[PDB]
Amino acid sequence: MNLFEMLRIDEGLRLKIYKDTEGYYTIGIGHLLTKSPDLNVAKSELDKAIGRNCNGVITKDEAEKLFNQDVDAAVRGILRNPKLKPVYDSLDAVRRCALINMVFQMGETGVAGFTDSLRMLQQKRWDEAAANLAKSRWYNQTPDRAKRVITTFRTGTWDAYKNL
């Protein structure tokens, strides 16, 4: 399965400049256009981003590029953090998608302050880490997503995404 799909399910794919929880113009799978309260700037950013005259609308094949981009940025930010690097680095392919899905949801910073759980993950105490995450505020905000991600950590499979 994939990150995209994964994010696709967890996040949601929007094809029209929409407003963030924070109120920042966003689009695709949580792709941020601008912090500027100006729709006319999201636009510009977008087009700037897309390479065409969008009109505040893109197309999936497009949301996925934005996506793949936004993704490798995250990853580099992950490797730059000296506190996320060892974990991520130790994780397997599927557990990594779980880290990423998190960074995405909370940024490289909010994620890095899961001092404990991170250690467990690093250590391989799947049930512990998970139990751990289960306590967070995070998990209390966005449960279904949290469940899936924790589960994936624990199990280390897509099972959590297979029968939605």
From Swiss-Prot:
Induction: Expressed late in the viral replication.
Residue positions of the active site: 11 (proton donor/acceptor), 20 (proton donor/acceptor)
Class in the EC hierarchy, top level: hydrolase
Annotated consequence of substituting residue 20 to E/Q: Loss of 99% of enzymatic activity
Known outcome of mutating residue 30 to A: Almost complete loss of enzymatic activity
Catalytic function, reaction form: Hydrolysis of (1->4)-beta-linkages between N-acetylmuramic acid and N-acetyl-D-glucosamine residues in a peptidoglycan and between N-acetyl-D-glucosamine residues in chitodextrins
Assigned GO CC terms: host cell cytoplasm
pH dependence remark: Optimum pH is 7.3.
Compartments reported by the entry: Host cytoplasm
Single GO MF descriptor: lysozyme activity
EC number: 3.2.1.17
UniProt keyword annotation of Hydrolase present: yes
Residues the entry annotates as binding substrate: 32, 104, 117, 132
Function text: Endolysin with lysozyme activity that degrades host peptidoglycans and participates with the holin and spanin proteins in the sequential events which lead to the programmed host cell lysis releasing the mature viral particles. Once the holin has permeabilized the host cell membrane, the endolysin can reach the periplasm and break down the peptidoglycan layer.
Family note: Belongs to the glycosyl hydrolase 24 family.
Protein name: Endolysin
The species this protein was found in: Enterobacteria phage T4
Phylogenetic placement of the source organism: Viruses, Duplodnaviria, Heunggongvirae, Uroviricota, Caudoviricetes
Gene, per the UniProt record: E
